[PDB]
Amino acid sequence: VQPLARDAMAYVLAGGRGSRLKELTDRRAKPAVYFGGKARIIDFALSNALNSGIRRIGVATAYKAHSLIRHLQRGWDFFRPERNESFDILPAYEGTADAVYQNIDIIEPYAPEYMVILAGDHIYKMDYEYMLQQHVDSGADVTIGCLEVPRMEATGFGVMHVNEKDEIIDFIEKPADPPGIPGNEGFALASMGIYVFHTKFLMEALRRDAADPTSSRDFGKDIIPYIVEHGKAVAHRFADSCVRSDFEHEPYWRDVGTIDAYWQANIDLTDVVPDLDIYDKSWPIWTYAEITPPAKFVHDDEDRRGSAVSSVVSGDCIISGAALNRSLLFTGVRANSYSRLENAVVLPSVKIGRHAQLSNVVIDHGVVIPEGLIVGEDPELDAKRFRRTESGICLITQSMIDKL
Amino acid sequence: VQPLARDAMAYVLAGGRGSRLKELTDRRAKPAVYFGGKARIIDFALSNALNSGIRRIGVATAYKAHSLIRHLQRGWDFFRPERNESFDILPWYEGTADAVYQNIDIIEPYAPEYMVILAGDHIYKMDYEYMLQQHVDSGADVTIGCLEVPRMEATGFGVMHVNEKDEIIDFIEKPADPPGIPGNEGFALASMGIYVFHTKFLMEALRRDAADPTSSRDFGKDIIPYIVEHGKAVAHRFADSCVRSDFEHEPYWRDVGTIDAYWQANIDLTDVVPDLDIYDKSWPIWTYAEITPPAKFVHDDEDRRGSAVSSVVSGDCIISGAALNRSLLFTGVRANSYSRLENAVVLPSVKIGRHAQLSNVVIDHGVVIPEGLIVGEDPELDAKRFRRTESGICLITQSMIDKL
């Protein structure tokens, strides 16, 4: 009868540094990185907890966390404890298990029956009620959310070796040749970093783990493999609980772990039929947002036409004689006369000077592009001035601009 | 030393039905009419009070007020009485003086030193501290906000006859030949419907007025002329207290009393340099707004190209193969392939069917435009199907569409 989410606390691991995103995460954590037009990455895991009916949320932070904490303070500010709601920001860790262990004194006063451990650095929509039900009905010590991926794609993941009842018999960190699913050997089960426990069980294990000087104090390296060995670990299929819009052709999950994958996932939202339906109202993503003026398009000559094509344009964007194609603009962008953006992911408050022409870029928050700058024409010059992927995507920060 | 706004209550008259706006105000009051992309008309008077430092606001409603009250409840909900703040929704009265008189029991517990009476159906920005200052320094029984307008334009206004100290010696309702300003007879002083009183003085002028069966129970017809004769009435120049952005070439103020004037004021926001700076942050306009997805533009062939030119587009707008020029779109608009909007004011949640072509229109909230519909091409056909101004602007509601 009663939803299991009533008795669950969501515990968000938001220490992720996202190193291979380089200067994008130099002064902010990966969960604080903007995505999709408005939100930040962490807002998806948070919104999944909210929409699943989980009213107690803890967020463990650490690295360059101030802008992540400022975001949480201002955007996730509507929980009231006297309605049995809590939003706890928990800065420091020794590992992902220690990030929970160190805050056991905040958890236990709430006495939640269940813990939902979440990675806060992925983009995905998921109804955690299904995982909670499966966890209690199975009897498991830990239920682990997993993606169905072709075996070749599973090589970058922690992979769960499963039997034909979906009980986890082995776990390999990044196998070059991942074990297949019994009876569907084309696909392997890749762990999402999503774990469901009985709270008292979990607390046994964080204490057991903290006493062990051999342990790296991580769920992935230490606690999960221990349970796979002497306990009972079961797998939950993302496809069973993923919240799919009518306009999403497959379950959506993205890591945006590299500058290419980050650029791709954002730019794919300019498609006619995007993989991610950012217009779904039935599973909405809450974030911090302000009342902003509308987007403005001005100038209509043969020399300059302020307009966007196959693009996503947020509010408070003034497109002044600038030509946009296959670009995603966050809030507050000013693009000026005769400038051109193509294949551009443009983070909030960026300013594009007159006559600048940029292609295949990610522009960091607040960057002021000088008048006349060109990017995307000269691979060697671009690679010297900016961070350039093998793909030809240039990440542009203010400190790179300042160095010219 | 201390600001006079600390001791003032702003009392907003929001009963205005706006008859000359016809079907636009059939199901909502004029203060509830959308303006500028996001806000409603009433939000300007409210924001002027807020930004002037006035912390107690009462809003008198009446005519078809369901959507106005819903807006006030959801958008103007952040006043907390224990911080000495109040926002009172006070719902069709005998007149604008009766709208205050009937709610003396709400005012007097607050015991504000001053009352700032505001018309809630105009678009303008004004720092009321200046008017309060002038009121106490002058000695007046009422200080009246006035526009400087050329005499020919002043005939549609209540007009104040002044002497050389700006003391009001007479008041004429809509004079066919308006009295000029001494030493500037090209211009007359037109009353804005903005009155400042000492609260104690105002309370019996309202009691005196309610006892008089000859009175229409209005500030303009009854209360002000009595004081102009028997008391002390002084005029305040809008130009002295108007809040002008650096990007506004003159004091603004708009009545949008007709469908043309409403269409013009909205469409003028598509200019390169608009008369109204909706991007000013020094005097912001608070309104009700929701977290919305960004605007999206799709399709790019010779048959259809989704893009906007010389246009203002709000969030949650999907512009799918539709061509927009000199248009203002509110939130939630869906424009579909091969459709065309020109000189269009498009209120929230409107849907434009494929192949439709509309020019010089105001589209009401939520209207679904059928595929292939053309407007602006055939003056005789348009005038039969819709409400058409002499200038050629057609107002389109759902019930007009339903009868085709």
mmCIF file of N, CA and C in Angstrom, chain A residues 43-139:
data_model
loop_
_atom_site.group_PDB
_atom_site.id
_atom_site.type_symbol
_atom_site.label_atom_id
_atom_site.label_comp_id
_atom_site.label_asym_id
_atom_site.label_seq_id
_atom_site.Cartn_x
_atom_site.Cartn_y
_atom_site.Cartn_z
ATOM 1 N N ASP A 43 21.118 18.481 -10.963
ATOM 2 C CA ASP A 43 19.679 18.690 -10.843
ATOM 3 C C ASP A 43 18.871 17.501 -11.340
ATOM 4 N N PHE A 44 19.469 16.624 -12.146
ATOM 5 C CA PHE A 44 18.735 15.464 -12.642
ATOM 6 C C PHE A 44 18.565 14.412 -11.553
ATOM 7 N N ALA A 45 19.655 14.052 -10.873
ATOM 8 C CA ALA A 45 19.548 13.109 -9.763
ATOM 9 C C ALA A 45 18.641 13.656 -8.669
ATOM 10 N N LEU A 46 18.800 14.937 -8.331
ATOM 11 C CA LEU A 46 17.933 15.572 -7.343
ATOM 12 C C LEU A 46 16.470 15.502 -7.766
ATOM 13 N N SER A 47 16.177 15.863 -9.018
ATOM 14 C CA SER A 47 14.793 15.849 -9.485
ATOM 15 C C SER A 47 14.232 14.435 -9.533
ATOM 16 N N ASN A 48 15.075 13.443 -9.831
ATOM 17 C CA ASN A 48 14.626 12.056 -9.783
ATOM 18 C C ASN A 48 14.190 11.669 -8.376
ATOM 19 N N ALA A 49 14.963 12.072 -7.365
ATOM 20 C CA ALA A 49 14.574 11.822 -5.980
ATOM 21 C C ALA A 49 13.254 12.511 -5.658
ATOM 22 N N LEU A 50 13.163 13.806 -5.967
ATOM 23 C CA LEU A 50 11.934 14.568 -5.756
ATOM 24 C C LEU A 50 10.733 13.901 -6.420
ATOM 25 N N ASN A 51 10.839 13.613 -7.720
ATOM 26 C CA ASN A 51 9.700 13.079 -8.460
ATOM 27 C C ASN A 51 9.378 11.641 -8.080
ATOM 28 N N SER A 52 10.334 10.911 -7.507
ATOM 29 C CA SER A 52 10.077 9.556 -7.039
ATOM 30 C C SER A 52 9.360 9.526 -5.699
ATOM 31 N N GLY A 53 9.198 10.675 -5.053
ATOM 32 C CA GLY A 53 8.560 10.753 -3.762
ATOM 33 C C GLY A 53 9.511 10.753 -2.591
ATOM 34 N N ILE A 54 10.814 10.833 -2.838
ATOM 35 C CA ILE A 54 11.793 10.871 -1.758
ATOM 36 C C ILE A 54 11.915 12.316 -1.295
ATOM 37 N N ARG A 55 11.688 12.546 -0.006
ATOM 38 C CA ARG A 55 11.622 13.898 0.534
ATOM 39 C C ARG A 55 12.828 14.253 1.392
ATOM 40 N N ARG A 56 13.715 13.300 1.676
ATOM 41 C CA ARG A 56 14.941 13.544 2.423
ATOM 42 C C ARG A 56 16.120 13.334 1.480
ATOM 43 N N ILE A 57 16.912 14.387 1.275
ATOM 44 C CA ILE A 57 18.043 14.356 0.354
ATOM 45 C C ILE A 57 19.279 14.898 1.059
ATOM 46 N N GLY A 58 20.360 14.129 1.025
ATOM 47 C CA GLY A 58 21.682 14.605 1.415
ATOM 48 C C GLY A 58 22.601 14.631 0.207
ATOM 49 N N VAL A 59 23.398 15.693 0.098
ATOM 50 C CA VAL A 59 24.332 15.870 -1.009
ATOM 51 C C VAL A 59 25.732 16.001 -0.427
ATOM 52 N N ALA A 60 26.580 15.009 -0.691
ATOM 53 C CA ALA A 60 27.968 15.033 -0.249
ATOM 54 C C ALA A 60 28.820 15.731 -1.301
ATOM 55 N N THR A 61 29.454 16.833 -0.915
ATOM 56 C CA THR A 61 30.319 17.605 -1.795
ATOM 57 C C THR A 61 31.745 17.594 -1.256
ATOM 58 N N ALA A 62 32.649 18.203 -2.026
ATOM 59 C CA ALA A 62 34.066 18.222 -1.687
ATOM 60 C C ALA A 62 34.838 19.185 -2.580
ATOM 61 N N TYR A 63 35.138 18.761 -3.808
ATOM 62 C CA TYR A 63 36.083 19.487 -4.648
ATOM 63 C C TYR A 63 35.439 20.719 -5.275
ATOM 64 N N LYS A 64 36.138 21.861 -5.173
ATOM 65 C CA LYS A 64 35.712 23.163 -5.693
ATOM 66 C C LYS A 64 34.205 23.337 -5.581
ATOM 67 N N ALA A 65 33.666 23.139 -4.387
ATOM 68 C CA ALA A 65 32.232 22.922 -4.233
ATOM 69 C C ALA A 65 31.417 24.183 -4.027
ATOM 70 N N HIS A 66 32.049 25.349 -3.970
ATOM 71 C CA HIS A 66 31.344 26.519 -3.482
ATOM 72 C C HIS A 66 30.188 26.877 -4.425
ATOM 73 N N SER A 67 30.463 26.836 -5.730
ATOM 74 C CA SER A 67 29.442 27.156 -6.730
ATOM 75 C C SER A 67 28.397 26.049 -6.795
ATOM 76 N N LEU A 68 28.796 24.813 -6.483
ATOM 77 C CA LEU A 68 27.811 23.747 -6.340
ATOM 78 C C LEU A 68 26.960 23.974 -5.100
ATOM 79 N N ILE A 69 27.590 24.369 -3.991
ATOM 80 C CA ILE A 69 26.849 24.621 -2.759
ATOM 81 C C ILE A 69 25.961 25.848 -2.914
ATOM 82 N N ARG A 70 26.470 26.899 -3.567
ATOM 83 C CA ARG A 70 25.655 28.085 -3.810
ATOM 84 C C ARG A 70 24.437 27.749 -4.663
ATOM 85 N N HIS A 71 24.608 26.862 -5.645
ATOM 86 C CA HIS A 71 23.483 26.418 -6.464
ATOM 87 C C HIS A 71 22.455 25.669 -5.625
ATOM 88 N N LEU A 72 22.913 24.698 -4.832
ATOM 89 C CA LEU A 72 22.012 23.948 -3.960
ATOM 90 C C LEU A 72 21.276 24.867 -2.988
ATOM 91 N N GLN A 73 21.978 25.850 -2.414
ATOM 92 C CA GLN A 73 21.346 26.751 -1.455
ATOM 93 C C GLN A 73 20.207 27.536 -2.086
ATOM 94 N N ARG A 74 20.418 28.042 -3.297
ATOM 95 C CA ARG A 74 19.473 28.968 -3.906
ATOM 96 C C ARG A 74 18.406 28.262 -4.732
ATOM 97 N N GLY A 75 18.699 27.077 -5.260
ATOM 98 C CA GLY A 75 17.746 26.374 -6.098
ATOM 99 C C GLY A 75 16.967 25.297 -5.365
ATOM 100 N N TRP A 76 17.591 24.658 -4.378
ATOM 101 C CA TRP A 76 16.963 23.542 -3.680
ATOM 102 C C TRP A 76 16.645 23.939 -2.243
ATOM 103 N N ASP A 77 15.803 24.960 -2.101
ATOM 104 C CA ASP A 77 15.624 25.690 -0.855
ATOM 105 C C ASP A 77 14.214 25.573 -0.292
ATOM 106 N N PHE A 78 13.380 24.694 -0.843
ATOM 107 C CA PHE A 78 11.955 24.681 -0.539
ATOM 108 C C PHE A 78 11.541 23.513 0.346
ATOM 109 N N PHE A 79 12.495 22.771 0.902
ATOM 110 C CA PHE A 79 12.173 21.684 1.816
ATOM 111 C C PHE A 79 11.987 22.256 3.217
ATOM 112 N N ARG A 80 10.921 21.840 3.895
ATOM 113 C CA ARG A 80 10.626 22.320 5.240
ATOM 114 C C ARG A 80 10.609 21.131 6.190
ATOM 115 N N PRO A 81 11.480 21.099 7.203
ATOM 116 C CA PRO A 81 11.589 19.900 8.052
ATOM 117 C C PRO A 81 10.313 19.519 8.777
ATOM 118 N N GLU A 82 9.454 20.479 9.116
ATOM 119 C CA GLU A 82 8.233 20.137 9.831
ATOM 120 C C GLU A 82 7.190 19.483 8.937
ATOM 121 N N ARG A 83 7.426 19.425 7.625
ATOM 122 C CA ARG A 83 6.652 18.588 6.719
ATOM 123 C C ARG A 83 7.357 17.272 6.406
ATOM 124 N N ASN A 84 8.328 16.880 7.235
ATOM 125 C CA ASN A 84 9.099 15.647 7.058
ATOM 126 C C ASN A 84 9.946 15.699 5.787
ATOM 127 N N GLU A 85 10.578 16.842 5.550
ATOM 128 C CA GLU A 85 11.392 17.072 4.367
ATOM 129 C C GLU A 85 12.744 17.592 4.819
ATOM 130 N N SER A 86 13.802 17.152 4.156
ATOM 131 C CA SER A 86 15.108 17.684 4.490
ATOM 132 C C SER A 86 15.964 17.744 3.237
ATOM 133 N N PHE A 87 16.747 18.811 3.139
ATOM 134 C CA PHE A 87 17.779 18.943 2.120
ATOM 135 C C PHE A 87 19.054 19.336 2.847
ATOM 136 N N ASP A 88 19.977 18.392 2.972
ATOM 137 C CA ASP A 88 21.209 18.593 3.716
ATOM 138 C C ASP A 88 22.382 18.662 2.751
ATOM 139 N N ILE A 89 23.142 19.748 2.833
ATOM 140 C CA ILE A 89 24.364 19.929 2.061
ATOM 141 C C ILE A 89 25.526 19.547 2.966
ATOM 142 N N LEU A 90 26.289 18.527 2.563
ATOM 143 C CA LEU A 90 27.236 17.848 3.445
ATOM 144 C C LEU A 90 28.641 17.891 2.854
ATOM 145 N N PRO A 91 29.349 19.005 3.004
ATOM 146 C CA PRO A 91 30.735 19.071 2.533
ATOM 147 C C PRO A 91 31.674 18.344 3.485
ATOM 148 N N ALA A 92 32.861 18.035 2.971
ATOM 149 C CA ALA A 92 33.879 17.355 3.763
ATOM 150 C C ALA A 92 34.553 18.318 4.735
ATOM 151 N N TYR A 93 36.699 13.807 0.927
ATOM 152 C CA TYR A 93 36.488 12.532 1.613
ATOM 153 C C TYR A 93 37.498 11.462 1.177
ATOM 154 N N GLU A 94 37.560 10.361 1.951
ATOM 155 C CA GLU A 94 38.410 9.203 1.664
ATOM 156 C C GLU A 94 37.898 8.350 0.529
ATOM 157 N N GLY A 95 36.666 8.561 0.116
ATOM 158 C CA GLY A 95 36.077 7.741 -0.914
ATOM 159 C C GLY A 95 34.580 7.899 -0.836
ATOM 160 N N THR A 96 33.903 7.189 -1.730
ATOM 161 C CA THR A 96 32.467 7.390 -1.831
ATOM 162 C C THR A 96 31.719 6.748 -0.672
ATOM 163 N N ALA A 97 32.296 5.709 -0.064
ATOM 164 C CA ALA A 97 31.723 5.125 1.140
ATOM 165 C C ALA A 97 31.975 6.003 2.352
ATOM 166 N N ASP A 98 33.156 6.618 2.415
ATOM 167 C CA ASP A 98 33.468 7.513 3.517
ATOM 168 C C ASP A 98 32.613 8.770 3.465
ATOM 169 N N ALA A 99 32.221 9.195 2.259
ATOM 170 C CA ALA A 99 31.362 10.364 2.130
ATOM 171 C C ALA A 99 30.025 10.149 2.821
ATOM 172 N N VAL A 100 29.563 8.906 2.893
ATOM 173 C CA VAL A 100 28.359 8.584 3.648
ATOM 174 C C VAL A 100 28.682 8.328 5.116
ATOM 175 N N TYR A 101 29.751 7.569 5.377
ATOM 176 C CA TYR A 101 30.142 7.236 6.746
ATOM 177 C C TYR A 101 30.299 8.483 7.609
ATOM 178 N N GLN A 102 30.975 9.507 7.083
ATOM 179 C CA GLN A 102 31.258 10.708 7.862
ATOM 180 C C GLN A 102 30.007 11.477 8.257
ATOM 181 N N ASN A 103 28.844 11.143 7.693
ATOM 182 C CA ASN A 103 27.610 11.890 7.925
ATOM 183 C C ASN A 103 26.509 10.983 8.453
ATOM 184 N N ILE A 104 26.899 9.833 9.007
ATOM 185 C CA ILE A 104 25.993 8.932 9.692
ATOM 186 C C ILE A 104 25.244 9.637 10.821
ATOM 187 N N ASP A 105 25.872 10.650 11.421
ATOM 188 C CA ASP A 105 25.228 11.377 12.511
ATOM 189 C C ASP A 105 24.111 12.287 12.020
ATOM 190 N N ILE A 106 24.089 12.606 10.727
ATOM 191 C CA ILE A 106 22.959 13.330 10.165
ATOM 192 C C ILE A 106 21.876 12.358 9.706
ATOM 193 N N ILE A 107 22.264 11.165 9.252
ATOM 194 C CA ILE A 107 21.299 10.206 8.721
ATOM 195 C C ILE A 107 20.459 9.612 9.845
ATOM 196 N N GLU A 108 21.119 9.091 10.879
ATOM 197 C CA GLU A 108 20.425 8.285 11.881
ATOM 198 C C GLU A 108 19.306 9.024 12.612
ATOM 199 N N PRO A 109 19.416 10.318 12.944
ATOM 200 C CA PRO A 109 18.242 11.021 13.492
ATOM 201 C C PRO A 109 17.011 10.946 12.603
ATOM 202 N N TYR A 110 17.186 10.862 11.284
ATOM 203 C CA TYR A 110 16.042 10.736 10.392
ATOM 204 C C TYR A 110 15.481 9.324 10.390
ATOM 205 N N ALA A 111 16.307 8.337 10.734
ATOM 206 C CA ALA A 111 15.974 6.915 10.725
ATOM 207 C C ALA A 111 15.191 6.505 9.468
ATOM 208 N N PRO A 112 15.728 6.765 8.272
ATOM 209 C CA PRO A 112 15.054 6.267 7.070
ATOM 210 C C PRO A 112 15.201 4.758 6.988
ATOM 211 N N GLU A 113 14.152 4.097 6.504
ATOM 212 C CA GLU A 113 14.229 2.653 6.336
ATOM 213 C C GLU A 113 15.200 2.270 5.225
ATOM 214 N N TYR A 114 15.333 3.113 4.199
ATOM 215 C CA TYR A 114 16.123 2.797 3.018
ATOM 216 C C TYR A 114 17.044 3.955 2.663
ATOM 217 N N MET A 115 18.192 3.613 2.084
ATOM 218 C CA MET A 115 19.115 4.580 1.504
ATOM 219 C C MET A 115 19.188 4.374 -0.002
ATOM 220 N N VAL A 116 19.066 5.463 -0.752
ATOM 221 C CA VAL A 116 19.215 5.448 -2.201
ATOM 222 C C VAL A 116 20.471 6.250 -2.519
ATOM 223 N N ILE A 117 21.570 5.548 -2.775
ATOM 224 C CA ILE A 117 22.840 6.194 -3.089
ATOM 225 C C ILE A 117 22.865 6.536 -4.572
ATOM 226 N N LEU A 118 23.160 7.794 -4.887
ATOM 227 C CA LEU A 118 23.078 8.286 -6.255
ATOM 228 C C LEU A 118 24.378 8.961 -6.654
ATOM 229 N N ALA A 119 24.864 8.642 -7.851
ATOM 230 C CA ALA A 119 25.898 9.460 -8.467
ATOM 231 C C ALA A 119 25.264 10.745 -8.983
ATOM 232 N N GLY A 120 25.855 11.882 -8.628
ATOM 233 C CA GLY A 120 25.277 13.162 -8.983
ATOM 234 C C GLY A 120 25.853 13.802 -10.229
ATOM 235 N N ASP A 121 26.541 13.017 -11.060
ATOM 236 C CA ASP A 121 27.259 13.554 -12.210
ATOM 237 C C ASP A 121 26.791 12.935 -13.524
ATOM 238 N N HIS A 122 25.582 12.378 -13.550
ATOM 239 C CA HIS A 122 24.996 11.806 -14.752
ATOM 240 C C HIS A 122 23.681 12.504 -15.074
ATOM 241 N N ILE A 123 23.305 12.472 -16.351
ATOM 242 C CA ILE A 123 22.042 13.030 -16.826
ATOM 243 C C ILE A 123 21.132 11.871 -17.206
ATOM 244 N N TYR A 124 19.998 11.758 -16.516
ATOM 245 C CA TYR A 124 19.076 10.641 -16.690
ATOM 246 C C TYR A 124 17.840 10.899 -15.844
ATOM 247 N N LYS A 125 16.746 10.231 -16.202
ATOM 248 C CA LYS A 125 15.486 10.320 -15.476
ATOM 249 C C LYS A 125 15.055 8.922 -15.057
ATOM 250 N N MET A 126 14.747 8.755 -13.770
ATOM 251 C CA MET A 126 14.546 7.429 -13.195
ATOM 252 C C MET A 126 13.605 7.503 -12.001
ATOM 253 N N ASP A 127 12.595 6.631 -11.990
ATOM 254 C CA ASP A 127 11.656 6.504 -10.873
ATOM 255 C C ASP A 127 12.204 5.474 -9.890
ATOM 256 N N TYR A 128 12.758 5.954 -8.773
ATOM 257 C CA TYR A 128 13.409 5.082 -7.802
ATOM 258 C C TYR A 128 12.447 4.181 -7.038
ATOM 259 N N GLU A 129 11.135 4.418 -7.120
ATOM 260 C CA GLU A 129 10.189 3.537 -6.439
ATOM 261 C C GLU A 129 10.323 2.100 -6.930
ATOM 262 N N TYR A 130 10.590 1.919 -8.228
ATOM 263 C CA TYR A 130 10.722 0.576 -8.784
ATOM 264 C C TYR A 130 11.919 -0.150 -8.191
ATOM 265 N N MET A 131 13.040 0.557 -8.040
ATOM 266 C CA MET A 131 14.232 -0.053 -7.468
ATOM 267 C C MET A 131 14.022 -0.399 -6.002
ATOM 268 N N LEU A 132 13.323 0.465 -5.263
ATOM 269 C CA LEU A 132 13.029 0.185 -3.862
ATOM 270 C C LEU A 132 12.171 -1.067 -3.719
ATOM 271 N N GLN A 133 11.086 -1.153 -4.498
ATOM 272 C CA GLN A 133 10.241 -2.343 -4.485
ATOM 273 C C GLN A 133 11.046 -3.605 -4.782
ATOM 274 N N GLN A 134 11.822 -3.585 -5.867
ATOM 275 C CA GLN A 134 12.615 -4.760 -6.220
ATOM 276 C C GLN A 134 13.585 -5.121 -5.103
ATOM 277 N N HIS A 135 14.159 -4.112 -4.443
ATOM 278 C CA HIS A 135 15.102 -4.378 -3.360
ATOM 279 C C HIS A 135 14.439 -5.127 -2.209
ATOM 280 N N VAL A 136 13.244 -4.695 -1.799
ATOM 281 C CA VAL A 136 12.595 -5.352 -0.666
ATOM 282 C C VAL A 136 12.013 -6.699 -1.082
ATOM 283 N N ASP A 137 11.507 -6.805 -2.316
ATOM 284 C CA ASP A 137 10.900 -8.058 -2.759
ATOM 285 C C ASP A 137 11.951 -9.128 -3.016
ATOM 286 N N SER A 138 13.162 -8.717 -3.392
ATOM 287 C CA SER A 138 14.231 -9.660 -3.694
ATOM 288 C C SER A 138 14.875 -10.203 -2.429
ATOM 289 N N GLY A 139 15.061 -9.354 -1.426
ATOM 290 C CA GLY A 139 15.724 -9.761 -0.214
ATOM 291 C C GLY A 139 17.156 -9.315 -0.185
#
